[PDB]
Design a protein around this nucleic acid. Structure first.
Ligand SMILES: [Zn+2]
Ligand SMILES: [Zn+2]
Lengths: 187, 928, 73, 186
RNA sequence: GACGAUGUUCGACGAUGUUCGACGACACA
RNA sequence: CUCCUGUGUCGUCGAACAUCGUCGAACAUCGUC
């Protein structure tokens, strides 16, 4: 706190006031030394408070700079995550079926709802009752979306593998519904 | 005798075996529905037809069939005029025979006109029966349904046969009239062509057409030069339109040669345009509707043109395959790597719309491009498996994973200390008024999809456009006192920055991450990009874990961060101006504390003369809300951007709102479904679009109540002129009459006061007018909901209060009680005591059971439960006193635990205010 | 109090206890437990809520998780 | 507030000021005693405010730690306090069916499936000994959950179906005796 | 230059009030 | 690895401003010598 011009004036005025009070002279000079001690201490408190203000400004700058060094980190992390996800889901995407149905359109613009309907190589059927199963996925192969699918790995609501022989009319109250049938587009 | 001679003359030449239905003079049929407009009366009401003498025809075996020989007895001038006008249109096949003749009735050659073989009812009768529906007075509708083999009386024997939610087979029963209505439309077009070729000018009304299609009553027709006739078909088509989708009139257009006995048309699977088909459908059924129809609403001229053409598109889109709507993907090469991204959209209402900034062969992706490419459902659906979900009837796009997710809800946590305290204070006894009714209900894995399946209540609803684009003007007048427009990214006030960011952005952080990662320039660039492109996003449904009185699951819809981020910049200025205005109709942002409830109530009651109160509800408000009314709400909200956005910017913002909130792809479970319509819970502007829809339905009920009364019996001349001009501004005027819009708005605000919050309303209406039929009653709301919302509003959920000293029976789940507060009588809102006790006893977290950590919980519950202390029922006041005593006990045992566990006092010198009613009492008094 | 409020609160606590024992990992059992709980909470007659409480408690006691002689000591 | 060093200064200043104003001196004496009280009271307000801030921060940091400890205790002792609460409030119901079921299940006679409520539904309960079988069942009727059930078949541990006339005191040690009985609600 | 008097000036402190911000909780649509 | 939008109130903490008071201390004016 001694790095200010008014701190030296404060120390000097204090020393002069002490040398005066060690003698006890007349009040005409004593009061003037008290006034000088004021001017010193007043400018001292002024510049010290200004020093506190500037130190708090520096602290605010430090926090604002420690927050940007984390906002940029988070931005880079989420950018990497997003584009990794895009480039990853794109590898199970590009094939000849998609490039075949797109090249048949008027201007390469097809609806989205027919991309999995005509290019997906795996179906998933969720079946609530047994009559729905009997009318939908009876047998090992069935027909949906103008294709021919090949049942494999039918599971239940608990994600336990159900065998094709357990799905009967009498055993249906013994297994947890719905069943999630997985199929593969037969070539 | 004389009657027998008259009968043989009425037969004439045809092999008609007639029986005298009624007698040999006028029959005076009881209350047929007419659509009249002359210098005295105007409206679509039920009048008393009295100048006909009908004879019913019987075939062999002498059993009666549905063909009548209506014989009129009009004067000579009209006789010759109708004969002259009929000798021209006679060649048309859409015209009933007429057989003019003269018969000596009393001695002197009375001239008669005998239209031949016409059905008991007309098309106006069908339209009035289906539009003004009364579940206990629908004899004409039953007779029409039975006569044409839609059903049989054993169908009406059951309960709730009319309901759309319960018994949704009435949809099939109605759709059994579709081919009849469609043949009526084709015969109307034939008649219009014959009128044009013969040079006849006249107004086509609904009440001049059988339920077969044949036309008659050429009374007000004027002859002109051949080839230059002009039919007027505004009221006809407009009054008819709401039943073109109710009865599925154009179902036969999905078949090969447009007949129901043939296979469906196997549309090309890659086809998405369907514009020539829409123009063909229009020119085939609505040929003489003389207003330009734009199949693609991107070419429209303003928002009224958008509403018009979108109405027609929502009719015509029921013919095309459902796999041809949604985003239109396209192969994009991002640095030699082929993407599949959305470069358009095909709406059921807005036609086809293409993105303007589509850049094939990119090099690198910035942050906003990564956002718009990770938010699209194109890359997520093109890469996932197919899916056939047999648990729903909603369209399922794809499964994003290899297995389905079955999400459950847990029960609540019992707070046993509060319950023991309560039962020690004498609560929860046998046969008590205050008992526990609100619990935490648990759900199993089949709850999310069973709650998503309730979107089956959203059916394609075509609206009466000539009245919808007048109701929209009156609603816009209701929303004039606000200030809206676009704001920059640095003016947006976002609260709760640590909430989820939708799908797929919730894999990487909350909304804080995406609001800190994007500079204000990135957000402004994204917003300015959504005004030239459509960004389809994915919402995420997930079950809600909260306390309620019904055991039905509750889902919430988490919309993405792109959609919310840009909708905020679009709408937030207007939304804040709505939430910061007091004294208006939409009481959003008005508090109930500090005398706010009293102010709201005193504002509703403002100046009504014979005031009654009234309140209703919308069954399945969010599932069943039609798409036309949601588009109307969006346009009314966006009407504030008259200087910041051009016309194309506003259209592309509307397209984005639709593609993101109205008909987006919903991820319920681990699979993408197609949402047919409704409202997304998590949309930015839900509580305000709901208010616009509420006011729209109320104004529609009012115009239906005023136009459907006998204008000959309105004793007041002012209201009679107002009804005349209301009809003339609906169906005879194409432009906007701002003077009459202001006049009707003033009429409503004076005789029908409203207090609208999101889908919750209270009305203080003039009871004398509502009894005479000059403003809306509850039956008018029931009818309007039946035909414009596809729900049946049961009058057991509505209420009515004739004594204003008791407030509304319920508003925002609060009851109202007039108490004395320091020489003044004020209205105070009190809750349901079961609700407060349930919030006390059952919590949703194991730490909220400790109590001493959660004293502010009980302070807030006691703030809400204070006004019960003014109730005349003693247990209601005991609720509040119980909460205060429990707060005191909690403070005591917290002090004990702090003194024992640690060793220091925690007086705090200021916690004695919560034990005493002064705090909570001052919470309900005006500030100063 | 009354024998109804006690039954509803006990059914809440009982379904909590069952959920902590990982019954949610059995579709059929969890569906039956949720049905019984939601039916006890909506019941009006005390003589049927007790039957559904019997059923739910029997779901709990058929397992081997909760040591029963120590709890009921 | 009395233990700080400024206490003596402020007290002496206030006492001298009262004693001087009670004397009726000149105007300079009033202002000088006011000056003494001024500086004393000001420095006392200073360090008293310091102490108030310190004590408020201490109380805040103590109550936060208390809340943390109690929250951790609540989250840790769950799944062991919920069960004892459940049985505490199940004993308080004092029903004749629930108590019967609890007593059987604590003796060993646990069910194997959900206890049915319909008139012709199947129930299978385990029976671990003869004396447990002796008091719950006589002849054919099987009393469980305060209701009569009619036995269909009884099996041994190895699913070897046994009859009813074979279960007796002397014939008991010839089995493994987890006999799963079956019955329907009468 | 001193004496007395008022007020102007900053800083610390106390309080009140105002407004904004962060965190927690409750209710409602 | 799940919990949305909006509104409104309460509690705790922090910041800024204004007023008053506790005050410490410079002096800008007046009267006198
Ligand atoms: Zn248009
Ligand atoms: Zn704008």
């Amino acid at each position: 706190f001694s790095s200010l011009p008014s701190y030296a004036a404060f120390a000097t005025a204090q020393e002069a006031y002490e040398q005066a009070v060690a003698n006890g002279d007349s009040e005409v000079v004593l009061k003037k030394l008290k006034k000088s001690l004021n001017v010193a201490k007043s400018e001292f408190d002024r510049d010290a408070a200004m020093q506190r203000k500037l130190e708090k400004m520096a602290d605010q700058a430090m926090t604002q700079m420690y927050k940007q060094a984390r906002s940029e980190d988070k931005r880079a992390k989420v950018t990497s995550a997003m584009q990794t996800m895009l480039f990853t889901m794109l590898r199970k995407l590009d094939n000849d079926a998609l490039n075949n149905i797109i090249n048949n359109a008027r201007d390469g613009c097809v609806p989205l709802n027919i991309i999995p309907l005509t290019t997906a190589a795996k179906l998933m059927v969720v079946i609530p009752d047994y009559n729905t199963y009997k009318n939908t996925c009876d047998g090992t192969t069935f027909t949906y979306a103008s294709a021919l699918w090949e049942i494999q790995q039918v599971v239940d609501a608990d994600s336990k593998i159900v065998q094709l022989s357990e799905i009967s009319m009498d055993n249906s109250p013994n297994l947890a519904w719905p069943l999630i049938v997985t199929a593969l587009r037969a070539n | 005798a004389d009657a027998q001679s008259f009968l043989n003359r009425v037969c004439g030449v045809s092999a008609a075996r007639l029986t005298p239905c009624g007698t040999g003079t006028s029959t005076d049929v009881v209350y047929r529905a007419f659509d009249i407009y002359n210098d005295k009366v105007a409206g679509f009401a039920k009048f008393l037809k009295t100048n006909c003498c009908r004879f019913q025809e019987k075939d062999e075996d002498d059993n009666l069939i549905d063909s009548y020989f209506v014989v009129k007895r009009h004067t000579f001038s009209n006789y010759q005029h109708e004969e002259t006008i009929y000798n021209l249109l006679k060649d048309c096949p859409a015209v009933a025979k007429h057989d003019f003749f003269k018969f000596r009735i009393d001695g002197d050659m009375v001239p008669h006109i005998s239209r031949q073989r016409l059905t008991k009812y007309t098309m106006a009768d069908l339209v009035y029966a289906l539009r003004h529906f009364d579940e206990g007075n629908c004899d004409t509708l039953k007779e029409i349904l039975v006569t044409y083999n839609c059903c049989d009386d054993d169908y009406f024997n059951k309960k709730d046969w009319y309901d759309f939610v319960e018994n949704p087979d009435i949809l099939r029963v109605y759709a059994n009239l579709g081919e009849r209505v469609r043949q009526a439309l084709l015969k109307t077009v034939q008649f219009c062509d014959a009128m044009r070729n013969a040079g006849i000018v006249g107004v086509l009304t609904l009440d001049n057409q059988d339920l077969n299609g044949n036309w008659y009553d050429f009374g007000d027709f004027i002859q002109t030069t051949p080839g230059s006739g002009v039919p007027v078909v505004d009221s006809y088509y407009s009054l008819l339109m709401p039943i073109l989708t109710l009865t599925r009139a154009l179902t036969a257009e999905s078949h090969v040669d447009t007949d129901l006995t043939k296979p469906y048309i196997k549309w090309d699977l890659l086809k998405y345009d369907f514009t020539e088909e829409r123009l063909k459908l229009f020119d085939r059924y609505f040929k003489y509707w003389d207003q330009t129809y734009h199949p693609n609403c991107v070419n429209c001229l303003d928002d009224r043109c958008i509403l018009h053409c979108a109405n027609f598109n929502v009719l015509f889109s029921t013919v095309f395959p459902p796999t041809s709507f949604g985003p239109l993907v396209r192969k994009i090469f991002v640095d030699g790597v082929p993407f599949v991204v959305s470069t358009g959209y095909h709406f059921r209402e807005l036609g086809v719309v293409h993105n303007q900034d589509v850049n094939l062969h990119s090099s690198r992706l910035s942050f906003k491009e990564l956002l718009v490419y990770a938010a699209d459902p194109a890359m997520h659906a093109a890469s996932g498996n197919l899916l056939l979900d047999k648990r729903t009837t909603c369209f399922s796009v794809a499964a994003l994973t290899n297995n389905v997710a079955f999400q459950t809800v847990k029960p609540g946590n019992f707070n046993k200390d509060f319950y023991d305290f309560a039962v020690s204070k004498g609560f929860f006894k046998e046969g008590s008024s205050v008992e526990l009714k609100h619990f935490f209900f648990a759900q199993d894995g089949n709850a999310a999809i069973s709650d998503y399946d309730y979107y089956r209540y959203n059916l394609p609803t075509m609206c009466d456009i000539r009245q919808l684009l007048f109701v929209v003007e009156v609603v816009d007048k209701y929303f004039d006192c606000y200030d809206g427009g676009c704001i920059n990214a640095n003016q947006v006030i976002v609260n709760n920055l640590d909430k989820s960011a939708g799908f797929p952005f919730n894999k990487w952080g909350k909304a804080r991450l995406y609001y800190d990662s994007m500079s204000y320039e990135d957000q402004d660039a994204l917003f300015a990009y959504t005004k030239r492109n459509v960004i389809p996003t994915i919402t995420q449904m997930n079950l809600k874990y909260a306390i309620s009185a019904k055991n039905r699951a509750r889902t919430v819809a988490g919309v993405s961060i792109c959609s919310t981020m840009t909708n905020r910049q679009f709408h937030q200025k207007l939304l804040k101006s709505i939430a910061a205005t007091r004294g208006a109709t939409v009481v959003i942002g008005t508090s109930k504390f500090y005398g706010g409830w009293h102010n709201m109530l005193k504002t509703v009651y403002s100046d009504v003369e014979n005031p009654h109160l009234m309140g209703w509800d919308y069954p399945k408000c969010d599932r069943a809300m039609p798409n036309m009314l949601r588009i109307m709400a969006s346009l009314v909200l966006a009407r504030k951007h008259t200087t910041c956005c051009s016309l194309s910017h506003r259209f592309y913002r509307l397209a984005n709102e639709c593609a993101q909130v109205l008909s987006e792809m919903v991820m319920c479970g681990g699979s993408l479904y197609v949402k047919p319509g409704g409202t997304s819970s998590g949309d930015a502007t839900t509580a305000y679009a709901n208010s616009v829809f509420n006011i729209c339905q109320a104004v529609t009920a009012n115009v239906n109540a005023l136009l459907s009364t006998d204008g000959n019996k309105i004793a007041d001349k002012y209201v009679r002129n107002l009804q005349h001009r209301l009809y003339e501004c609906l169906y005879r005027n194409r432009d906007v009459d701002t003077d009459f819009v202001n006049e009707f708005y003033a009429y409503l605000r004076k005789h029908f006061s409203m207090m609208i919050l999101s889908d919750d309303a209270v009305v203080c209406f003039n009871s004398t007018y509502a009894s005479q039929g000059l403003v809306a009653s509850i039956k008018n709301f029931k009818s309007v909901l039946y035909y414009q919302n596809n729900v049946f509003m049961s009058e057991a959920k509505c209420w009515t209060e004739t004594d204003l000293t008791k407030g509304p029976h319920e508003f925002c789940s609060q009851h109202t009680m007039l108490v004395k507060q320091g020489d003044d009588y004020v209205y105070l809102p009190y809750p349901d005591p079961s609700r407060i006790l349930g919030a006390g006893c059952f919590v949703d977290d194991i730490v909220k059971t400790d109590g001493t950590l959660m004293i502010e919980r009980f302070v807030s519950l006691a703030i809400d439960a204070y006004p019960l202390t003014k109730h005349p029922n003693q247990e209601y006041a005991d609720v509040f006193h119980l909460y205060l005593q429990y707060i005191r006990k909690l403070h005591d045992e917290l002090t004990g635990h702090m003194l024992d566990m640690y060793s220091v006092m925690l007086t705090n010198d200021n916690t004695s205010r919560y034990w005493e009613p002064e705090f909570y009492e001052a919470m309900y008094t005006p500030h100063t | 109090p009354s024998k109804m409020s006690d039954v509803k609160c006990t059914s809440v606590v009982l379904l909590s206890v069952l959920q902590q024992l990982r019954v949610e990992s059995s579709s059929k059992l969890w569906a039956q437990c949720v049905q019984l709980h939601n039916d006890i909470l909506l019941a009006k007659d005390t003589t049927e809520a007790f039957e559904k409480m019997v059923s739910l408690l029997s779901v709990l006691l058929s397992m081997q998780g909760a040591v029963d002689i120590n709890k009921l000591c």
